[PDB]
Design a protein around this ligand. Structure first.
Ligand code: HEM
Ligand code: HEM
Ligand code: HEM
Ligand code: HEM
Length: 107
């Protein structure tokens, strides 16, 4: 089976890079993120060609990289989508986990 990589992974396809730590996400199944494609959980980098390789941040297709990290109502919960549920009504946690600046994702 695939193993989780080290913490401190930098996602840097964009000018707003974000650090991702697997160890704070163990309660999420691997395949909620590394989701099935053609019936098999896909562990490739998310922006692999043919995957979320569209770097236009307004795109909402299955190729839109920004969309896959930020939007709600997606087939798999996005970073922000899941964090909004986690924070609930707690405004401090909303800032920490979902804020567009000054959050744990974006400075
Ligand atoms: C569950 C224990 C789990 C595994 C296994 C796993 C593996 C994994 C690998 C091998 C990579 C590196 C991919 C590469 O070749 O560079 C990787 C990277 C990311 N992961 Fe992961 N991962 C597991 C769990 C989770 C969970 C639960 C999430 C979502 C909350 C998640 C997300 C990511 C992200 C984002 C990356 C970086 C990918 C990129 O920038 O393209 N993983 N993981
Ligand atoms: C990398 C860890 C990674 C993330 C993160 C990710 C997210 C993601 C979301 C949030 C969706 C739903 C979007 C919606 O509008 O419903 C989604 C959908 C698909 N993805 Fe993805 N995805 C990651 C990785 C990969 C990889 C490595 C590929 C290409 C092999 C890929 C492709 C797709 C496709 C196709 C979809 C649509 C799937 C379907 O509708 O069943 N993703 N992804
Ligand atoms: C998507 C790639 C994604 C990112 C980026 C992300 C980041 C992130 C940070 C920076 C934290 C704070 C802890 C740390 O520094 O590692 C954090 C915490 C939680 N997350 Fe997350 N997260 C991403 C994706 C997801 C997804 C898809 C879910 C749920 C399905 C999820 C959940 C959580 C939870 C729960 C935490 C802990 C909350 C707390 O208050 O610290 N994340 N994430
Ligand atoms: C708040 C809703 C919010 C906004 C707005 C926002 C913006 C943003 C931009 C402009 C980028 C770069 C897009 C581009 O292609 O130029 C970007 C990138 C990432 N973000 Fe973000 N972001 C907002 C909030 C959050 C939060 C709270 C997280 C983490 C849960 C998060 C995550 C990400 C990720 C991952 C990326 C991609 C990093 C990379 O590969 O460079 N965003 N965001």
């Amino acid at each position: 089976a695939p193993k989780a990589p080290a913490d401190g992974l930098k996602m840097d396809k964009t000018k707003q890079p974000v650090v991702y730590n697997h160890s704070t996400h163990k309660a999420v199944k691997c395949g909620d993120c590394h989701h099935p494609v053609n019936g098999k959980e896909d562990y490739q980098k998310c922006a692999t060609a043919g995957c979320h390789d569209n770097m236009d941040k307004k795109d909402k297709s299955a190729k839109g990289y920004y969309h896959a990290m930020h939007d709600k109502g997606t087939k798999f919960k996005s970073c922000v989508g899941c964090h909004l549920e986690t924070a609930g009504a707690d405004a401090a946690k909303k800032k920490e986990l979902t804020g567009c600046k000054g959050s744990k994702c974006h400075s």
